[PDB]
Design an enzyme around this catalytic site. Structure first.
Site, short mmCIF file in Angstrom:
data_model
loop_
_atom_site.label_atom_id
_atom_site.label_comp_id
_atom_site.label_asym_id
_atom_site.label_seq_id
_atom_site.Cartn_x
_atom_site.Cartn_y
_atom_site.Cartn_z
N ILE A 56 30.55 27.19 -19.97
CA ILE A 56 31.29 26.31 -19.06
C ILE A 56 31.95 25.09 -19.71
CG2 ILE A 56 30.12 26.90 -16.94
CD1 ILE A 56 28.02 25.09 -17.50
N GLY A 77 31.85 19.11 -28.30
CA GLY A 77 30.80 20.04 -27.93
C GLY A 77 31.22 21.08 -26.89
N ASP A 97 32.53 6.02 -22.41
CA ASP A 97 33.42 6.91 -21.67
C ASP A 97 32.90 7.25 -20.28
OD1 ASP A 97 35.56 8.51 -21.03
OD2 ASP A 97 34.98 10.20 -22.33
#
Ligand SMILES: CCCS(=O)(=O)Nc1ccc(F)c(C(=O)Nc2cnc3nc[nH]c3c2)c1F
Ligand SMILES: CCCS(=O)(=O)Nc1ccc(F)c(C(=O)Nc2cnc3nc[nH]c3c2)c1F
Lengths: 276, 269
Positions: free
Chosen positions: B16, B22, B129
């Site tokens: 997903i 990553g 973030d």
């Protein structure tokens, strides 16, 4: 790195945990937090080094079904702060308010419990007091495993607290524990049997032995194996494979009991075989 | 004590999570787990000592609103395994499927977020973030704070999909460390503006360079006249307060959380 929470960050509010060893409060610390204060009237080293090690056991745990350790306190009292779970606790549900749980859930609550326990074990932790009152249903769908902390700091410490919490919890003690045969009756399988009793809780909605009013005999008989749970009460629609697994978890002979991986396995399977 | 997960315990399943930084997989490890593998094609010490320290940042966190760090992996790849949250992610809700959130919730989602951030900060972590796509709604009612791990292992290893949440002083890379608590707040401001409007800021400017240029020169800011009709004046006010171009006029999180905890208990009547 370290978790010691300084004095006066934690805002101790409404009271709820009433016992003699410690006292549980809803609190605030970066939001809602439960806090248990050990009311040991300030140590007294190096009792204090022995409490830190028990915290060490706690932070070995990081799983979504074990209750979340958040930090501890040495300043005003000793204490442990954990997440705050909104919602009650399996015992309360089954026996206080008498929630009617749909069967699919019940199995679910069994699994998660099993889920967490499998974890507690995998990381060499023995719970030593599983029971529906230390299983909390958070937001009513998630299970957090409860009062397994400390222990090393209870059998070496003074108080009426290894006469209470050896007491309010006997129903979940496997026999080989009830009759204090020696030094360490406690063990994974000790834990399973208790898991067995919560199973029997879920599947019947009652505590075992509800018709024997003297709590001594319960002790005597259970440990002599003259008495065991009345497995003819698993409510009509309790899947045969579960009733079977329960009975398997409850074996007087601790060696015939399954460990948790197998227990979890047989629950993960009997689940995916039902909704049709 | 330690969290290193041995080879072949984690069962990496359906894919997903996209991208470099990553790639994320639903997995199984004592039950459902998310796993992010860094696909850095095996270190290469002591890059490896630098990944361990980033985990060190992670396990400093134990809060019910920060995403739960579960353990990491060095064996097949590098990786981090976290709890698996069933359900989507604020961004997905607001902008992909277009969930209609009841206002009481929206404020709730703001709080929890603020709740978690206050925590991340208290323990000297800067998120660097925040944004609706790293805020996950778990079982739809709880908020888990997301992609704050690493970072030290990203600016030393061989900024875009997230500009909307960059406070100006960050956009124009003025120097070495633009990032700071207040950097984080401004982003919190933009999610606030997300919740309260259900849109991303600047939906009518189609060149993504100008957004950058103007925002950092302060010629452009969020159109606060969009906080949906019933957005409490005290919030719209707090939002605008969180979004100050001048980073020093921005509230820190304790105050932010405080003004949200209060405007909440003043509504259901
Ligand atoms: C894994 C937790 C460490 S423990 O000491 O084993 N357990 C431990 C330690 C401290 C606590 F306050 C508790 C506890 O009962 N927490 C607790 C959590 N949420 C609640 N919502 C209502 N009452 C609650 C109590 C606990 F279960
Ligand atoms: C970079 C260090 C790890 S972290 O930033 O603390 N957390 C962290 C980092 C990277 C991720 F991809 C993720 C992640 O995707 N988690 C995650 C968790 N549950 C999910 N259910 C569906 N998608 C999911 C993703 C994460 F939760």
């Amino acid at each position: 790195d370290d978790w010691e929470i300084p004095d006066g960050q934690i805002t101790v509010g409404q009271r709820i945990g009433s016992g003699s060893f410690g006292t549980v409060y809803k609190g605030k610390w970066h939001g809602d937090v439960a806090v248990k204060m050990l009311n040991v009237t300030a140590p007294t080293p190096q009792q204090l080094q022995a409490f830190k090690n028990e915290v060490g056991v706690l932070r070995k745990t990081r799983h979504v079904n074990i209750l979340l350790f958040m930090g501890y306190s040495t300043k005003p009292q000793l204490a442990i702060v954990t997440q705050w779970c909104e919602g009650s606790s399996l015992y309360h549900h089954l026996h206080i308010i008498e929630t009617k749980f749909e069967m699919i859930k019940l199995i679910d609550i069994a699994r998660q419990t099993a889920q967490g326990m499998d974890y507690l074990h995998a990381k060499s932790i023995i719970h030593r007091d599983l029971k529906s009152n230390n299983i909390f249903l958070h937001e009513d769908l998630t299970v957090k495993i409860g009062d397994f902390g400390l222990a090393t700091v209870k059998s070496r410490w003074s108080g009426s607290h290894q006469f209470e919490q050896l007491s309010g919890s006997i129903l979940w003690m496997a026999p080989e524990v009830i009759r204090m045969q020696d030094k360490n009756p406690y063990s994974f399988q000790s834990d399973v049997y208790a898991f067995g009793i919560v199973l029997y809780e879920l599947m019947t909605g009652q505590l075992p032995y509800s018709n024997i009013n003297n709590r001594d005999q319960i002790i005597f008989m259970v440990g002599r194996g003259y008495l065991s749970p009345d497995l003819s009460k698993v409510r009509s629609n309790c899947p045969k494979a579960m009733k079977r697994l329960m009975a398997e978890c409850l074996k007087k002979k601790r060696d015939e009991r399954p460990l948790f991986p197998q227990i979890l396995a047989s629950i993960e399977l009997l689940a995916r075989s039902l909704p049709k």
